[PDB]
Design a protein around this ligand. Sequence first.
Ligand SMILES: COc1ccc(CNc2nc3c(ccn3CC(=O)Nc3ccncc3Cl)c(=O)[nH]2)c(OC)c1
Ligand SMILES: COc1ccc(CNc2nc3c(ccn3CC(=O)Nc3ccncc3Cl)c(=O)[nH]2)c(OC)c1
Lengths: 122, 122
Amino acid sequence: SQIQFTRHASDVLLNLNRLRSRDILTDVVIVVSREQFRAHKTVLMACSGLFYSIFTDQLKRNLSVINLDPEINPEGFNILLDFMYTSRLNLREGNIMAVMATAMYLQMEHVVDTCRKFIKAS
Amino acid sequence: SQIQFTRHASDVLLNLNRLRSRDILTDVVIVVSREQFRAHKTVLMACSGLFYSIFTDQLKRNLSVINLDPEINPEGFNILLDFMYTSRLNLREGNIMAVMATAMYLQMEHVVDTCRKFIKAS
Ligand SMILES: COc1ccc(CNc2nc3c(ccn3CC(=O)Nc3ccncc3Cl)c(=O)[nH]2)c(OC)c1
Ligand SMILES: COc1ccc(CNc2nc3c(ccn3CC(=O)Nc3ccncc3Cl)c(=O)[nH]2)c(OC)c1
């Protein structure tokens, strides 16, 4: 019976992305080969099975640096990080395989399924 | 030209609320008279002009406790905190004034405007 604010969640996410852009309250650096990306652990956990599994463990909860698998493409990771914070996925025929493999590694099942649909439709 | 995931933002918010429910990565306690509420500063900043103005200031960025104005009703605050994390506002004729006044204090203009519409429609 509560009143629904249909833009609230999108507004929240946009504002979280603004905070990331200003490095406000970011609490982890994700290192991917020669590149690094700062983020909020909460958003990573909300969007990725890998990050959820890492930070839910009290043993790893306070890590400030995560080194991703050396074989992960920083491009693929960047695309997915921007998706996490925007709901918009930049899939193209020139990056689909990198994005899909990265999404498998990050355990983002719905994104992987969408990548498969992209392949089917191309 | 990016692919839009129309449920992603809502899913993120739901997951953030799940993290709050488990006290995972919460980083502030909001004290409101005799009650206390834990939350994520990022979500508070995303949803409230008061919290945004507080935590954007490097002087207050690292506060772990915020004591709200003693005149603020903990009920009104609780209702609004749950709105922040759910997009659903529990307005009723028995709580409208408390919620509205609290939303004014928290600088949640759209919620205040909605409270005014509620009054107009009642
Ligand atoms: C409810 O059963 C779960 C929960 C979690 C996992 C991990 N696998 C996974 N996780 C994903 C996605 C997409 C985002 N997430 C993160 C997420 O759901 N986070 C979250 C969940 C519950 N409460 C708070 C939070 Cl932050 C994904 O495709 N697979 C699971 O794997 C089988 C099952
Ligand atoms: C863009 O101009 C602004 C930004 C902020 C304020 C503070 N007044 C206010 N803030 C509100 C609501 C509802 C949620 N918020 C928080 C918010 O917008 N947070 C945010 C903004 C930009 N980047 C990152 C973040 Cl976290 C509200 O009704 N009034 C402003 O007041 C005039 C103007």
